[PDB]
Amino acid sequence: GSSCEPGRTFDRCNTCRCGADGRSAACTLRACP
């Protein structure tokens, strides 16, 4: 599972693959450093 530290801000830097429908189909989710 996934969790975050209550109250705290965080930034995500994600890379997605676009589906046939012109919406994301697959994404690599990463914390931003």
Added chain:
Amino acid sequence: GSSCEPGRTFDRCNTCRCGADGRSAACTLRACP
């Protein structure tokens, strides 16, 4: 479709604050660095 080009990879970045339960967050779009 018109959000992304089918089969292309693209970057998507977010800024979040984590909810009290540590299992949820309120996020918005930001420019990727």
